[PDB]
């Protein structure tokens, strides 16, 4: 099956000073947001009709409350211990936790935390592991955290028992959207290139879903190894945009074409032909 294979929640907690902190949170299937966190209410926003997966409203409500309690207590405890942990304001903490379905069916869970944009800890084997960039501060935190009753056992349950069944239920519930095929459109443009008699040709590919795509500059059947792929950029409403570029000497552009392959095209590749002397659209 195609589309996302993982679910995770993220947290960003911004500490302005000893008495002001704000947290933002959300839930994702790979890159696709399916939950928001509403700080006005301390409840989740469900962005798709199927965002609850196969969970009951009761369990969903219970999970919202765990997160609400956690979000409040996290800020409270980080503020109380900031002095011991020699923290200088302002700082920002990040977390991500979730699970992923692998080839062959295994589901693997993960939890990672960051301070100042650098890895700080992870959870391996239901245990707090300090990260080297987190230094002695992260060693102190892990030794602290494992003494708070309930925390580690709740993390363990959520990571290894709640998340996998949630993941399987929501990938199924969302399959009409998650596994749909949306065709890209492609077009050509010519950019500037440094040095005498050099052109950059650009093949734009936009509006495709799922994310895997193949784009290559070609001369006939010969794929041009100079093809350079840009970063895959997002569009609104769950599609992607991608540029593939080729640098070529002025008199060698004629004969080039751009070939696009995508799961949605049912084997009918898009082929665009570069024409010289301004005979392009």
């Amino acid at each position: 099956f195609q589309g996302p294979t993982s679910f995770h929640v993220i947290q960003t907690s911004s500490f302005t000073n000893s008495t002001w902190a704000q947290t933002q949170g959300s839930g994702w299937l790979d890159d696709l947001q399916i939950h928001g966190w509403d700080s006005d209410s301390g409840t989740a926003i469900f962005l798709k009709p199927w965002s609850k997966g196969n969970f009951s409203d009761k369990e969903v409500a219970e999970l919202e409350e765990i997160f609400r309690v956690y979000i409040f207590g996290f800020a409270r405890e980080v503020q109380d211990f900031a002095g011991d942990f020699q923290m200088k304001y302002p700082f920002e903490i990040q977390g991500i936790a979730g699970c992923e379905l692998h080839s062959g069916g295994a589901i693997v869970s993960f939890l990672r935390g960051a301070l100042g944009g650098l890895d700080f800890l992870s959870v391996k084997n239901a245990s707090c592991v300090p990260s080297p960039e987190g230094g002695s501060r992260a060693q102190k935190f892990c030794a602290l955290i494992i003494q708070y009753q309930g925390i580690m056992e709740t993390v363990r349950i959520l990571l290894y028992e709640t998340c996998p069944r949630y993941l399987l239920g929501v990938l199924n519930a969302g399959k009409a959207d998650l596994q749909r095929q949306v065709k890209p459109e492609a077009w050509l443009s010519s950019g500037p290139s440094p040095g005498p008699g050099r052109l950059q040709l650009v093949c734009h590919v936009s509006g495709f879903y799922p994310k895997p795509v193949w784009v290559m500059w070609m001369r006939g059947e010969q794929e041009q190894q100079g093809t350079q792929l840009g970063d895959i950029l997002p569009n609104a409403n769950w599609t992607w945009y991608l540029r593939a570029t080729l640098d070529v000497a002025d008199g060698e552009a004629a004969g080039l074409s751009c070939r696009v392959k995508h799961s949605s095209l049912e084997g009918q590749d898009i082929i665009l032909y570069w024409r010289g002397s301004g005979l392009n659209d």
């Binding site: 960003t12 933002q24 959300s26 944009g117 650098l118 459109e185 997002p234 569009n235 609104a236």
Partner: protein, 100 residues
């Protein structure tokens, strides 16, 4: 936990630009840290009011990213830009949209 990262700013249209045909202008702001950021989309240097954006997310390396977008109708002479302010920037950074 100390070095700040400046935004990368990429401006692009959803569809190929055709003068007089409705389209969507995207501004993808990524690679920055900390998360506090201000982003506008500009038409002829003036702020566009009906602009949507994504909820905050971040990459594997913990850098934040956001997508800002608005409906727009490109014309021959109108200019569109994405204007970003961040703690890493001494004044707003304006990045103009360009078709080619």
């Amino acid at each position: 936990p100390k070095i700040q990262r400046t935004p990368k700013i990429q401006v692009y249209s959803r569809h190929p630009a055709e003068n007089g045909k409705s389209n969507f202008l995207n501004c993808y702001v990524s690679g920055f840290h900390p998360s506090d950021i201000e982003v506008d989309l500009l038409k002829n240097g003036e702020r566009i009011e009906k602009v949507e954006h994504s909820d905050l997310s971040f990459s594997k390396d913990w850098s934040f990213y956001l997508l800002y977008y608005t409906e727009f109708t490109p014309t021959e002479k109108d200019e569109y830009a994405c204007r970003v302010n961040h703690v890493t920037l001494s004044q707003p950074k304006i990045v103009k949209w360009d078709r080619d």
